[PDB]
């Protein structure tokens, strides 16, 4: 219904993207550095990952380019 | 209790009066700026009219709201002049506002109102022409030309004034209208522009397939017509219930009673002496089968206005129910046919046992000459049937105004005062109508009304703008051909909504 | 009309047997305190069936437990099956009363 | 019940065109980024053209209502050029405004337009060959399905569909005398199969029932019996209780079914087509007792599908058992059992030669998305050939028209003059917006892109060669074999100045309170 | 007050400036709202019903004020029309125009009493010399231009253009029918809109004109025996069954058709009770119309409680419900009953028409209701314009003349008296130009030409001025010698009634 | 709900079953790190690298640190209850502790096998209390001491008393009530009475044939029921019914001395059964 024309959302696609593709190689690695998790949903409730996966599934997050790189991954 | 008097409750008033004369402007003429208007519902209203979409608007103005009326007073009589008087009396509402302000508010406003008229609704009446059968024209000519006429403006192709003869002769069929509703065009997918017709009763754009439907006669050298409000199929009576089965016959059985009661509907009907059932509604799966094992013609989605216009050519009547039907509430022809026409399958009725309807069928199949000719040959038959209804005819675009605003400021110098601004203003009124075309046909109208004025002045017959040939000339001769009658009317519309008004700076208003 | 009356029917007719349980259940209780008073000091007796057993003091008192309890459950059995049968009645009644009307 | 004042209100349409004929403008062609969709309901999808898109998205303003309401006619028949008008007519709207702001009627400007795309439809005529043939139009299909197959699902053109695309359409071109109707041809794809899974469906496709395969699968005659009534007893698609009231009825229900069965299978089989197509849902059972007697035996069928498999037949249905004549069967060319997929069911396909009053053209995908992706290329290159049978035209596109058709029309201004050489002069640089948009939307330069084919423009006359659309370092149309149906184009130059003429249409812009309401 | 005390909203300012101004904007209103005009005056109803009318009590209902000032005085007016016709809407602008002169003298400081006898003072020496103001009287109630000269002036007091014919067709609507001896009906002279035709085209049919349908066969006999009824047929059936409709199923098919034979009991009961014709305030019934055309009982279909009415009011009709077979009560009254189609509708007719009982009911053609309105209006008052009830009205100048005869006389009169009555009797007789200045801007000049002239002409009773050019320049019409009359009653009560409360709305200060 | 303030509410809870110990301390603990920190944070030190020092670290210091600390006998209770009452006496709770120390290391010296006296989870040792008493009516118990009892003929006293345990329902199913009834009317009720009143003895009867002396039943509703007339019937077996029990005793019993769960009459089975060498209710103390 609304268009999403090209830089500010490539802007938006990365700028999310590019939050996501952070927090998760912060964790990856072997020391690749923690983050907590949390669930809004129940309080905080949390635990501190070093898998993106879960942060998807946690904190939902929403962006075209994650909502693709959350299929990807 | 609410009201307000004064000349700001007048100047309230002309200030509704000039905006709504502004819609309309060159609404009827071909060009403009639409506002498509979708109401709360999603109701869009690109309406030709502003009438229409004056239905739509709601005027705070009771003042304004007369022309509402009186618009469509000069609507409801013709279907022209609504724009035309709406830019009349605004026209006089803009006249005398100064005026007013300088004095002429007294009710020498309105008693200088009706002679101006007066002086020209005969002098109108006057200057207009009449013709016969054999007299410029076949009576066809006539016609002939006033479609073509109104097969110019949009220039399409050549074929507008063979397109010309076409519409005369159901024009001349019925002509128990100036309207259309009766014959109207039928946009006719496939065929040529070259190629078009006009039935001798009703005939319906779309039927559709079903079982058997090339088999389905599509030719009766006479139907009875069944005319349904309703339709039948396997959901109108359900093909789907369930049974407790032992023996599998009970399978056989919930299938087979309820495949009875569909057809039993339609050979009802059937037997009530329909060969041409027509569902406005579909037909549906199991239905149809009936229609085809019936070997009597069905059709689904039909035109409901069709279906009416249906039984205005065929007499028949809508059968709201299919249930032991009968042939009075049935429909007519003496030809019951039906062809596709490029892909719409084309119901022909005609041979009817009467006709309040005839139409014309516009082939081509093409969006663009056709919308074009339509909205052309509406007003032919505007002006094709009125021409035969009056045949005495006058001519537009400043063809009288000119001659009119001059006869008046002519008498000016004898009246000088107030009153002669009503001899020199409501002569000035005329000249804006043909001042919408020359934008429309994309002059100066000034120089066009100027020389035209003096062109009526060292000229006046009938030279003025013509916005079909886009230039200016004597229209009559031009053939820019409307009868005088509706002149008159909206004259004494204009004239007749602004004076009521000027007289009121005084309007009440309560909610109680 | 006769539909609304069988479920007005069989409703007070399986609240019939219902309620006399009570009183029977009543009964039960007032044998308990003799089923804990008798020692067998005189000779117990069930009586089911048109034969009189034999009957002994400790085997009497869990079945008038078990008819106490029996019972006890046999109140519910109907009070499911009254709102049912209650029920059906009220359905129809504004149907069949009209229905009886007109 | 505010009012905007003509060139206001324009000057508030021209403010929807704009981003909305943009969104195609980096969309143009496989060098244009295609659409991406996105929902309130939560479902981010990638759309194309005008249509998908601008219907997916919707449209808040009367301009951008038209422009779906514009938008249909195109994709309805040619299915190629939908975006293409977006972009032309919004560049022609702003051309509009522009002349107003140049001080130039609305009126006049629509005016000298229309016939302004004669100069290019002239323009067009001559362009590249009014003709084709069935073994050339192959190979131009071929061609379209090559830019249709390799723009779009996948960039590999699958020769199948390339030719699924050609055959069929010809099946019902060459029934209806080089006219076709893109309602006959039909894709249809079902997941489960392959992109490559992709089949050539001249009649209808459905699941054969089984309600046991190994009770024989097998299709027989080549003709299909659609039947309203049993072919074993019957059942709408609903719960039908089973039991028997004693240890005996126990014993005679099996024999019931297998006694109609029979009956069925020979009524039926009488009738004709031993493969009936009951309207009626049955029991997994019984079906497969008739199955396990012989003939495997349609049930559970969709309303719509016996009645649907019927008109394209041509022939009726059987709505009473009792009633039995092969024209209340259907028609099957050929009744085929079909395996759909590696994953899934036999289907049976009835493949009409007898008559196909529909024509669904078959092809499976990995995924529903990807399917659809396909879909979208072949409903779109079925529907060139659709037109492009009913004339056999083709003009070399992309740019190379758009640089040339602007020829005729910008050097037509000063043979015009008055208003419609303005009306020639920013009618046809509208036209030139697209090859400087498509290199736009490539990596390209497009004023020194479009100056590239301009100079052939001046030395060389409508190129059959051009720019290169798939952003090859050549550039032609031939080369690049970018030719769209002679017809398109022009039914695509249809469209553009229509709705700078729609835009204008009466004189009332005023609102009652309700315009968009 | 200067505490919290009591309750006024007048007094002090109010009283002195704010009542008087409460007494001025609507006079101001009425000024060319009467006599000779050319104003209009837009009106919406409760409706929002766009109207226009130079009639106050329309305007004045819906008209709203926190004083009684304004409030008070337009029963006068309706006092007036309770009496006649227009001049009403010449009563209060006389009192608001005389009025503001004592603001003016409480300016210049003059006492209420002082400043309210001088008037009620000259109230009589107008109504003294008023008779001889008396210029001729009213000869033939039958003969049509002996009225219509006179009604011709109301509808004037109303509206200038149409007062010709109109007051032709009141006259040939029969104010001849009655005596006026003080017997005079206006609930027997009816005036009943055609929506249809020309308002030229309207007529007088002699005999209630009710446009409502003639619905089947007509009346049984002429002198009907009348059943008028609120609802006499509301349905015989009721359906509640287990579905409502069928439940056991031929318990249906009996009331659907056990309902109609009792819409023929009702009806053959209409036949039964005696009813010549049946009246239906609530619908027809097809079948009971269907007896209803066996038993040829005249029905109407759907009757206005207007109709009922009028119906109950001169049939001796009582309109009821009945779910019963019917009771004659509303009996008969009109001795021929029948259809009519003027402007081409079924019109109910009933006359008996006795020169007392008699009928003649103004049937309006007319394509606009608004038009046929304020069209009424006026001649809502040229009947009881007409209505004096003296068969000789005294006949006086109509339009205005007799204004100017008495401001020379009473003034020079107020002249003559001493003292601060003086200027109380002297305004008494300058509150006459205002009209003659109101109408004389809708003529379209200045009062003091007018006036001066107006004066100037002295003694007429003749001399005068409205909406007309001979209300321009000359300051003369014939509002006497054209044609131009009054009865000499209105002006008694146009004077009396605006002077008392003139007097009265002042002294008030609460 | 602060998260890392969460991981204090985690933190101590832990040296709570860790210890029960020091769980003030360990909240002490942290911070003192956290202190240096944002030190090194404000060096910029990584945290890989900050942590990866310190774990390490504490075993470095862990060993320092032990050898500071004294071995004492774990196999001599009375080492162990003078470091525990030394410990208890350089801690918080002397009052009761010092005088349940002959208690508690005892139950503890019970559950200590090893001289090692390993880590002595406190599983096997159950915690009870008795409203009121005296805290010199607090003991150890050597075998269960159970909450209650249910006897109508059943047998007070057992002993060698293989202890049932009940997961099936005693009574027959519930069905109105407790047991099997379908009537509208009495020959309905009459004739089918017969059926539910004599399986549930047979129910009951095979449990003593299993071999039940005691029997834990968890509670009616971790039951269908038992219907005490029948389990009248019941405790006319003589078996020591236990009845309305926690699933956690249950599983206590199950896991300490052996009862473990029946849900079945084949499922009585001795390992399903307990062994009470003496079971007997007392009411005193």
């Known amino acids: 219904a609304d268009e999403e024309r090209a830089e500010t959302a490539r802007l938006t696609s990365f700028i999310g993207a590019i939050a996501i593709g952070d927090l998760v190689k912060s964790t990856l690695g072997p020391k690749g550095m923690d983050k907590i998790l949390l669930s809004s949903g129940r309080d905080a409730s949390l635990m501190v990952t070093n898998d993106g996966a879960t942060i998807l599934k946690n904190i939902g997050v929403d962006n075209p380019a994650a909502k693709v790189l959350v299929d990807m991954s | ?418 009153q002669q601004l009503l001899i020199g203003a409501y002569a000035k009124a005329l000249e804006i109508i043909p001042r919408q075309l020359c934008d429309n046909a994309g002059f100066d109208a000034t120089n066009i009304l100027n020389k035209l004025r003096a062109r009526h002045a060292q000229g006046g017959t009938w030279y003025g703008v013509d916005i079909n040939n886009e230039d200016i000339a004597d229209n009559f001769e031009a053939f820019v051909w409307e009868p005088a009658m509706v002149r008159i009317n909206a004259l004494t519309a204009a004239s007749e909504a602004a004076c009521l008004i000027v007289s009121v700076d005084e309007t009440i208003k309560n909610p109680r | 009309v006769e539909k609304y009356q069988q479920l007005q029917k069989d409703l007070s007719k399986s609240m019939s047997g219902r309620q006399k349980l009570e009183a029977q259940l009543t009964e039960n209780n007032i044998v308990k305190e003799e089923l804990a008073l008798l020692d067998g000091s005189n000779v117990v007796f069930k009586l089911l069936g048109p034969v009189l057993v034999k009957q002994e003091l400790g085997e009497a008192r869990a079945t008038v437990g078990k008819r106490l309890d029996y019972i006890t459950a046999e109140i519910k059995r109907y009070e499911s099956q009254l709102r049912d049968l209650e029920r059906q009645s009220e359905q129809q009644r504004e149907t069949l009363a009209q229905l009886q009307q007109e | 019940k505010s009012r905007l004042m003509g060139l206001e209100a324009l000057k508030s349409h021209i403010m929807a065109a704009k981003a909305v004929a943009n969104t195609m403008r980096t969309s143009l062609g496989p060098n244009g980024l295609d659409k991406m969709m996105v929902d309130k309901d939560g479902d981010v999808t990638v759309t194309n053209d005008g249509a998908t898109i601008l219907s997916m998205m919707d449209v808040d303003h009367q301009i951008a209502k038209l422009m779906v309401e514009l938008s249909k006619s195109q994709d309805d028949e040619i299915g190629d050029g939908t975006t293409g008008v977006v972009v032309l007519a919004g560049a022609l709207l702003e051309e509009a405004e522009q002349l107003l702001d140049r001080g130039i009627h609305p009126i006049r400007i629509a005016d000298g337009y229309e016939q302004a795309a004669r100069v290019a439809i002239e323009h067009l005529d001559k362009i590249s060959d009014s003709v084709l043939v069935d073994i050339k139009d192959t190979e131009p299909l071929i061609q379209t399905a090559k830019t249709t197959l390799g723009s779009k699902v996948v960039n590999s053109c699958h020769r199948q569909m390339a030719e699924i695309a050609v055959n069929a359409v010809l099946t019902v071109a060459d029934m209806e005398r080089r006219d076709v109707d893109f309602e006959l041809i039909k894709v249809e794809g079902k997941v489960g199969g392959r992109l490559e899974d992709t089949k050539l469906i001249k009649g209808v496709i459905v699941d054969k029932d089984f309600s046991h395969p190994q009770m024989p699968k097998k299709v027989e005659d080549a003709k299909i019996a659609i039947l309203t009534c049993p072919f074993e007893p019957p059942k709408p698609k609903t719960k039908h209780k089973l039991d028997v009231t004693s240890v005996e009825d126990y014993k005679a229900l099996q024999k019931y079914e297998k006694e109609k069965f029979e009956e069925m299978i020979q009524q039926i089989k009488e009738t004709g087509a031993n493969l009936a197509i009951c309207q009626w849902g049955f029991d997994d059972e019984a079906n497969h007792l008739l199955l396990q007697n012989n003939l495997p035996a349609v049930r559970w069928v969709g309303g719509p599908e016996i009645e649907l498999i019927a008109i394209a037949t041509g022939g009726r249905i059987v709505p009473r058992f009792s009633e039995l004549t092969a024209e209340k069967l259907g028609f099957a060319g050929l009744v085929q059992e079909i395996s759909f997929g590696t994953t899934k069911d036999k289907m049976l396909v009835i493949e009409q030669c007898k008559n196909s009053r529909a024509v669904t053209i078959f092809i499976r995908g990995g995924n529903k998305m990807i399917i659809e992706e396909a879909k979208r290329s072949l409903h779109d290159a079925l529907c060139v050939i659709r037109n492009l049978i009913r004339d056999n035209r083709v003009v070399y596109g992309g740019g190379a028209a758009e640089i040339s058709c602007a020829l005729a029309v910008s050097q037509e201004a000063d043979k015009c003059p008055t208003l419609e050489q303005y009306a020639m002069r920013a009618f046809a640089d509208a036209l030139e917006v697209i090859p400087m948009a498509l290199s736009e939307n490539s990596g390209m330069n497009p004023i020194q892109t479009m100056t590239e084919v301009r100079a052939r423009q001046v030395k060389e006359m409508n190129p059959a060669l051009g720019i290169d659309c798939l952003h090859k370092g050549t550039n032609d149309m031939k080369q690049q074999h970018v030719i769209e149906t002679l017809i398109g184009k022009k039914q695509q130059i249809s469209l553009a100045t229509q709705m700078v003429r729609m835009i204008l249409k009466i004189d009332d812009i005023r609102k009652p309170g309700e315009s968009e309401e | 007050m200067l505490k919290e005390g009591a309750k006024h909203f007048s007094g002090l300012e109010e009283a002195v400036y704010r009542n008087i101004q409460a007494c001025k904007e609507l006079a101001q209103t009425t000024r060319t709202a009467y006599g000779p005009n050319g104003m209009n005056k837009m009106v919406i109803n409760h409706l929002e019903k766009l109207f226009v009318t130079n009639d106050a009590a329309t305007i004045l209902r819906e008209l709203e004020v926190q004083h009684p000032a304004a409030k008070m005085i337009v029963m006068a007016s309706h006092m007036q029309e309770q009496e006649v016709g227009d001049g009403t809407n010449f009563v209060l602008v006389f009192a608001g125009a005389l009025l503001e002169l004592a603001e003016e003298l409480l300016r210049i400081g003059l006492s209420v009493s002082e400043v309210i006898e001088g008037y009620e003072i000259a109230c009589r020496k107008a109504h003294e010399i008023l008779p001889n103001l008396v210029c001729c009287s009213a000869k033939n109630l039958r003969d049509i231009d002996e009225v219509s000269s006179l009604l011709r002036t109301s509808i004037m007091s109303k509206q200038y253009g149409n007062e010709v014919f109109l007051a032709k067709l009141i006259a040939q609507a029969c104010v001849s029918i009655f005596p006026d001896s003080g017997h005079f009906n206006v609930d027997n002279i009816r005036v009943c809109k055609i929506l249809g035709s020309g308002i030229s085209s309207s007529s007088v049919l002699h005999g209630m004109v009710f446009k409502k349908e003639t619905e089947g066969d007509v009346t049984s006999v002429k002198d009907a025996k009348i059943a008028v009824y609120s609802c006499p047929f509301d349905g015989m059936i009721t359906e509640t069954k287990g579905t409502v409709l069928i439940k056991t199923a031929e318990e249906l098919m009996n009331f659907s058709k056990g309902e109609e034979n009792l819409m023929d009991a009702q009806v053959k009961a209409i036949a039964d009770t005696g009813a010549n014709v049946v009246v239906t305030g609530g619908k027809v019934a097809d079948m009971a119309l269907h007896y209803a055309n066996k038993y040829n009982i005249m029905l109407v279909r759907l009757n206005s409680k207007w109709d009922l009415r009028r119906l109950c009011k001169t049939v001796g009709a009582t309109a009821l419900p009945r779910l019963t077979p019917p009771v004659l009560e509303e009996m008969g009254h009109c001795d021929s009953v029948y259809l009519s189609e003027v402007g081409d509708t079924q019109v109910v007719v009933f006359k008996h028409e006795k020169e007392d009982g008699a009928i003649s009911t103004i049937v309006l053609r007319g394509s606009t209701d608004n038009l046929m309105d304020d069209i009424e209006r006026a001649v809502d008052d040229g009947v009881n314009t007409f209505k004096v009830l003296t068969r000789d009205k005294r006949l006086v100048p109509g339009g205005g003349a007799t204004e100017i005869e008495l401001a020379k006389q009473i003034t020079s009169y107020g002249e003559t008296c001493p003292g601060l009555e003086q200027y109380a009797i002297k305004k008494f007789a300058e509150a006459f130009e205002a009209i003659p200045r109101a109408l004389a801007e809708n003529s379209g000049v200045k009062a003091n030409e007018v006036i001066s002239k107006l004066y100037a002409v002295h003694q007429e009773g003749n001399k005068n001025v409205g909406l007309d050019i001979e209300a321009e320049v000359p300051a003369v019409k014939d509002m006497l010698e054209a044609g131009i009359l009054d009865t000499y009653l209105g002006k008694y009560w146009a004077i009396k009634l605006a002077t008392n409360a003139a007097v009265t709305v002042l002294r008030v200060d609460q | 709900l602060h998260p890392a303030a969460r991981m204090l509410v985690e933190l101590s809870k832990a040296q709570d079953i860790e210890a029960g110990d020091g769980t003030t301390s360990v909240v002490i603990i942290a911070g003192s790190l956290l202190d240096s920190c944002t030190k090194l944070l404000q060096k910029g030190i990584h945290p890989t690298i900050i942590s990866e020092s310190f774990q390490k670290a504490l075993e470095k210091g862990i060993e320092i640190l032990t050898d500071m600390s004294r071995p004492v006998e774990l196999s001599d209770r009375e080492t162990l209850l003078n470091s525990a009452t030394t410990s208890l006496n350089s801690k918080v709770v002397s009052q009761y502790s010092s005088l349940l120390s002959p208690m508690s290391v005892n139950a503890v010296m019970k559950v200590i096998d090893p001289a090692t006296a390993t880590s002595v989870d406190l599983r096997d040792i159950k915690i009870v209390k008795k409203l009121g008493g005296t805290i010199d009516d607090c003991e150890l118990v050597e075998g269960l001491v159970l909450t209650q009892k249910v006897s109508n003929s059943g047998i007070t006293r057992v002993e060698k008393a293989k202890i049932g345990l009940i997961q099936f329902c005693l009574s027959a199913p519930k069905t109105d009530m407790d047991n099997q009834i379908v009537v509208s009317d009495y020959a309905q009720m009459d004739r089918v009475l017969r059926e539910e009143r004599a399986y549930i003895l047979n129910l009951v009867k095979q449990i003593k044939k299993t071999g039940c002396n005691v029997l834990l039943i968890q509670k009616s509703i971790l039951r269908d029921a038992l219907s005490d007339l029948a389990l009248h019937f019941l405790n006319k077996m003589k078996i020591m019914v236990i009845k309305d029990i926690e699933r956690e005793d249950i599983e206590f019993i199950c896991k300490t001395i052996g009862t473990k769960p029946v849900a079945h009459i084949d499922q009585f089975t001795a390992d399903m059964l307990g062994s009470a060498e003496l079971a007997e209710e007392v009411n005193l103390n």
Not at chain 2, 381 to 394: G, L, P, Q, Y
Request: hydrophobic share 40%.
């Open chain 2, 1 to 418: 209790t609410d009201s307000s008097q004064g000349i700001p409750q007048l100047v309230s008033n002309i200030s509704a009066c000039q905006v709504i004369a502004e819609a309309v402007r060159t609404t009827l003429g071909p060009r403009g700026m639409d506002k498509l208007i979708v109401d709360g519902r999603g109701k869009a209203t690109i309406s030709n009219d502003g009438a229409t979409i004056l239905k739509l608007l709601d005027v705070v103005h009771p003042a304004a709201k007369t022309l509402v009326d009186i618009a469509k007073s000069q609507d409801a009589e013709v279907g022209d002049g609504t724009t035309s008087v709406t830019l009349l009396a605004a026209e006089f509402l803009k006249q005398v506002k100064p005026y007013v302000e300088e004095g002429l508010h007294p009710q020498i406003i309105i008693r200088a109102f009706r002679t101006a008229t007066q002086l020209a609704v005969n002098k109108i009446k006057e200057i207009a022409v009449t013709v016969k059968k054999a007299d410029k024209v076949e009576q066809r000519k006539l016609l002939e030309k006033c479609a073509m006429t109104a097969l110019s403006s949009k220039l399409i192709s050549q074929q507008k004034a063979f397109f010309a003869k076409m519409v005369v002769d159901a024009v001349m069929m019925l002509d128990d209208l100036l309207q259309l509703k009766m014959i109207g065009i039928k946009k006719v997918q496939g065929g040529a522009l070259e190629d078009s017709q006009l039935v001798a009763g009703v005939a319906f754009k779309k039927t559709f397939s079903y079982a058997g439907f090339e088999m389905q006669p599509k030719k009766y050298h006479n139907p009875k017509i069944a005319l349904l409000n309703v339709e039948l199929e396997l959901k109108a009576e359900k093909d789907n219930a369930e049974i407790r089965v032992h023996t599998v016959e009970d399978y056989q059985a919930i299938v087979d009673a309820e495949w009875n009661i569909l057809y039993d509907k339609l050979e009802k009907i059937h037997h009530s002496g329909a060969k041409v059932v027509l569902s406005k509604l579909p037909i549906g799966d199991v239905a149809t089968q009936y229609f085809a094992d019936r070997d009597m013609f069905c059709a689904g989605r039909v035109p409901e206005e069709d279906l009416k216009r249906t039984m205005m050519a065929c007499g028949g009547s809508i059968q709201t129910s299919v249930n032991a039907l009968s042939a009075d509430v049935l429909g007519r022809c003496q030809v019951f046919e039906e062809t596709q026409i490029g892909g719409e399958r084309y119901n022909f009725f005609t041979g009817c046992p009467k006709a309040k309807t005839c139409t014309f069928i516009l082939r081509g199949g093409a969006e663009q000459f056709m919308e074009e000719t339509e909205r052309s040959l509406h007003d032919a038959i505007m002006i094709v049937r009125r021409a035969i209804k009056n045949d005495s005819v006058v001519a537009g675009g400043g063809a009288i105004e000119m001659e009119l605003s001059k006869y008046l400021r002519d008498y000016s110098r004898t009246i000088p005062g107030k």
